[PDB]
Amino acid sequence: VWKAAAIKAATEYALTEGAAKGLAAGNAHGMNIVIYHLKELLIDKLVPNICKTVSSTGDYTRVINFSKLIIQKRGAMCGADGGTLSKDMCTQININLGTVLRNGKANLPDKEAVPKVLNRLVSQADKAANEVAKDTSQSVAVKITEQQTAAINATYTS
Amino acid sequence: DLPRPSISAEPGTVIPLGSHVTFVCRGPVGVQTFRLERESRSTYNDTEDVSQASPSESEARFRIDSVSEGNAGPYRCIYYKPPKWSEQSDYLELLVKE
């Protein structure tokens, strides 16, 4: 008539369901961060359907695949021929991509920079994903490690 | 340490409206990326398609098909030889007759 093995299983179920639910909220957050910066850094202007195609694939770290694409359309729309966008955009795009270095001089050659800022960016959402993950992991295990124990105690009294 | 680049135009620097021109950046051996600059902050092109023009130097080539009088004016070269950029070449002035 003892509650031993039950609690051990209720906490085990508490952690795993905890971690699982955290990881899914972490991943969906990371994705919104990437999404958000992809527009902050004006990459919408380099490729417009950039957000929906990173959206429609989950796995935020799959933004790095778009780097050669970004390189191609930067040179296309901000090249020495004049470019497609305005000079004020291009200036900003170039600073955000880490190629042209705010105060004027060159930064790094457009081939190293683009992947560098994208990897910086996913590493930036990794930190923000591993945070929301840890958080809802504790927050869901508590509320279910509580709901269970509240239901095991009522099982025992009778 | 590393020599400043040279810029030139082909066929020349004086090119009729609508015609074609080809900027030729060159610097030493072992250049990874060339950058052709027009207003170095906003508008520029980077190429990895570097060719060798001599035992001593290498060159990349950038080309505009139909030259607008917009396209007139200044241009310069830079090359990136890891881990650092070169100083900036001397100005080339492209002239386009109305």
Which 8-state DSSP code applies to residue B95?
Answer: B
Among the listed residues B78, B63, B76, B77, the one whose alpha carbon sits nearest the alpha carbon of residue B15: B63
Contact yes or no for A60/A27 (Cβ under 8 A): yes
Among the partner-chain residues A71, A78, A110, the one whose CB lies closest to the CB of B42 is A78
What DSSP letter does each residue of A36-78 carry, written as one string?
A: HHHHHTTHHHHSTTHHHHHHTT--GGGGGGGHHHHHHHHHHHS
- Which resolution, in Å, applies to this structure? 3.0
Q: Is the dihedral of CA A115, A120, A124, A127 positive or negative?
A: positive
Under an 8 A CB cutoff, do B43 and A81 touch?
yes
What approach was used to elucidate this structure? X-ray
3-state class (DSSP) for residue B65: coil
For chain B, the residues before each gap (C–N > 2.5 Å) are: none
Among the listed residues A81, A108, B25, A82, the one whose alpha carbon sits nearest the alpha carbon of residue A94: A108
Distances (CA, A) of B54 to A4, B47, B57, B85, B90: 83, 19, 5, 21, 21
Which structure tokens are listed for B90? 């001397």
Which structure tokens are listed for A68? 């050669």
Under an 8 A CB cutoff, do A80 and B85 touch?
no
Among the partner-chain residues B37, B41, B85, the one whose CB lies closest to the CB of A80 is B37
* Interface A-B: count of C-beta contacts within 8 A: 67
Which 8-state DSSP code applies to residue B80?
Answer: E
Under an 8 A CB cutoff, do B45 and A82 touch?
no
- Which element (helix H / strand E) includes A142? helix A113-156
Instruction: Looking at the complex, report in whole angstroms how far the Cα of residue A72 sits from the nearest Cα belonging to chain B.
Output: 10
